[model samples]
Target chain A: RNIETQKAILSASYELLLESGFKAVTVDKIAERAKVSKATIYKWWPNKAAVVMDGFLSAAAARLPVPDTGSALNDILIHATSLANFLISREGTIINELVGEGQFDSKLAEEYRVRYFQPRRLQAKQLLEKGIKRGELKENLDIELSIDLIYGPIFYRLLVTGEKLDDSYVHDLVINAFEGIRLR
Target chain B: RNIETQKAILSASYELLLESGFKAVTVDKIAERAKVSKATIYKWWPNKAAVVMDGFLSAAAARLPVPDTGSALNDILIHATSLANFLISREGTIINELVGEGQFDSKLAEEYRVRYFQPRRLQAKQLLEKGIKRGELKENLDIELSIDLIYGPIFYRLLVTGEKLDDSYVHDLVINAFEGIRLR
Candidate 1:
């Protein structure tokens, strides 16, 4: 019934979702955390998951910064590494949970991928290609594969391999891309 | 006490855990799905998370084929693509969920990474270095960065862009790794 109540619910949802995993988040907890009634929580968001999604959108928009280092490779790699660090940071835990929850809920997973991932990648891809044309990047590099080379280890460290990421690996990635792979 | 019951409980835990995800898989469901008593499920796994993890270990060990391709580059790229498909496939949802869940539970994530990621990368690293020594690969190319170029795009497409993938991309990746950014 109140706009203030909706904002309160969202704020609480954001806080709880990040600190606690998806399973731990509930309408009751949001209401209790937000100082609102359960009725108020449901009236606005479809479920706890929806609330989490919206909260991520609002919070992450400011967070996913575009890299502009005045050089294409530097710009792209810096943002890529920055994004990697962002995802690994404490606040990014909700992203991890939503993705897990999305696995069970196919629609949620698909939606999450479409709404969040596609746009960012396109931006990165466009910039890299632009660099290629501007003579900042080598002409022969495969843009698709180049992205993979630059990014794979970050995910391996964070998602698959689960290691702490540093700029050292990232620097190697950029160097590999700009120069050929022949052994010295 | 029955090994049959123990195996049933473990198997059921793995399937349901993977199917519905770690948090969603209930103890009662594990019992019902396994056709064992709830006591049987609880006696072994203190919680649903424990059972799912055990199932993941069993499934991953059995399912994650250890690659030993006669051709090192072919071996690494094939195994890497296979992994990419696994992470991105419809049936691979449970694995993705576990990856996401690993964020909150460092212990769980660490175990998952150790079991899945380490062996493959180590093999790939050694193989690439060998290629350099043989003079089959370019002399100036960075060996470690070369791995990044080969694998990074595969994960990037899956994790961020949600693109449909194929082996054709892998061919281009291998090509890029050897050639570098120099105009051919």
Candidate 2:
């Protein structure tokens, strides 16, 4: 019953978010749509962004599964490709809105990092660590920096450059990231 | 006289932006502060974001001069480090706000790209091209991708990770960018 209620609330939050946008989504509306009391939502989520993020993350996590293709670089390529595709989709629009909203709200920014970003970082970190362990990458590879190098361009294009985040771009990004641009 | 008047308007816009924030800045307020008519301000700039962005860029450009240190990598390092320092300062705060605001305003985002981002990109591209000519970098270096790779991490940290954009971080970033994380 508890699980079902939570799922219902999340579903309602996502629906409202998609129907309108983040600003229009409200806890009160979510409760109404989910057929639950306002208190029920507040009990689970502190606010609308939290509930919406929970719903969004839950949906996004499934599509962006961490791959272990026994080759770390290949795995990163596949995962990053999936991420690029996801960012160009309708869901990308929602995440962009959330990131934009986060700029104005400190609490929401913190929530985004902790809930949405950290999990993904950890997964990528593990992948890099495995690559180092298997001698696929440098033994002294800076894992954290590597992760940033890998993911930064995609987010940069999405948020700043407004460039196309397609497979070709992702391919170059991952390849260039792995093979340094210096003519060594 | 015209240049002085333009400077006054830009100065007023910048001051108001710093005093309060983007939302609080208006053409009327800028005119009032600069002792210019609203008509004069409108004749010069289309809207509030444009005025503010012009003001911000004018001030920022002086601080972020493109270095021609003869070595492309060194030039990139010096330039990116300055940017990193700028982003961690008060100006960084304002730029962050503007970027956040831009997400909601497509016109503003375009202005940001054309007025703010593109110029810097061109400057960086020239530096990279020079490096290739000097044989300091790979001759076939993907200049566009390289620019993204170098700047992406800095902006990502500024906008997403909320990490410290210090000299050490920039050093590591530039190094890793030129020298891939993979074992050669």
Candidate 3:
């Protein structure tokens, strides 16, 4: 029953979520779409945040390619661009709603940051270390502050201001993060 | 009587907010503390958030020092430093909490950003523009992006990480922002 229910709910939530959004994905709607009952939906979790959590995990599990460590810069760009795509994608709409709600709930904020942000940062940090070791990047990089500088603007502009997460913005972010935007 | 009553309530709300935080200051508490009746509080404010909304405004009015443009860099630094200090101080503590809470509530967030973020952004923009115009700083700079990159890191680190808001962070922020951190 658990396996049957998981398969049913995950498939429906993922499709409907991509079609509509997290807010629109009612338990009844998911049940109707999946041919399951509201009781089956409630048995899985409380709200859309938890339900979509599984939905996104399933959607992203195989879709996101692992960064190739052929070179440090290569890996970083590959990883960041992949992330930028996901953040700005239709399939990731539920996750966006989760983050919007996360801003208000400390537990949600920490959990979301850990589940989403920390892993990304950890990946970036490893890539940066590789870059520094190979003398591909500056020696003076305060990794943490620099990381925030690079990524903070993306989230800030995305969640704070209702800005588009376009490739142009991504290019500027990557360039500014690497080349630095000031004149000597 | 209405004017006097409102003033007294705001004054009390502002004081309690400073001692505790915006979260701690209830409308009932404000009415009692201010020696005004609860009906008077309810007559004006639907909730404590509304009371603290105005209370934060009243607190900031007394705190903002008049901007005096010494040099372009000097003027810019003055505004940045003043805001940083305010964000770290007691009165500013409540104000920042109010702003954070505002994100969850649509009506409150609107008032929060305008009352808090806009005035500060306007001051920085003016200072940067003044610098560009006076030839003290480079022309054709993305003044908006410049402000975000510079202060976004500071705000992110300070508020999210709960790190120390010391002078060194400020120096690093300004220097990196002005000069950038690439090989140059």
All DockQ scores: 0.43, 0.75, 0.21
Candidates 1 and 2 compared: the better one by DockQ is: 2
Indicate the DockQ of the complex predicted as candidate 2.
Answer: 0.75
lDDT of 3 by residue, B74-166 (tens): 665666677778777765665445545544455666666565666777777877777676765644667777677766766665445445776
Per-candidate iRMSD: 3.4, 1.1, 3.5
lDDT of 2 by residue, A1-184 (tens): 4999999999999899888978788899999999999998888898887898898876654346888999988989988898888888876676677788778887778888888788777888988888988998965889999999988998899998888889998998998998877777
Local distance difference test scores for all models = 0.65, 0.85, 0.67
Q: Quick one: ranking by lDDT, best first?
A: 2, 3, 1
Candidate 2: regions farther than 4 A off: A59-62, B59-62
B74-138: candidate 1 lDDT, tens digit per residue: 65666666766676565555565666666566766655556555555666777776666666676
Summing lDDT over every window of 10 consecutive residues in candidate 2 chain A, give the lowest-scoring window.
A57-66
* Ranking, TM-score, top scorer first: 2, 1, 3
By lDDT, the best candidate is 2
Per-candidate TM-score against the hidden true structure? 0.69, 0.92, 0.65
| Model 1 local distance difference test score | 0.65
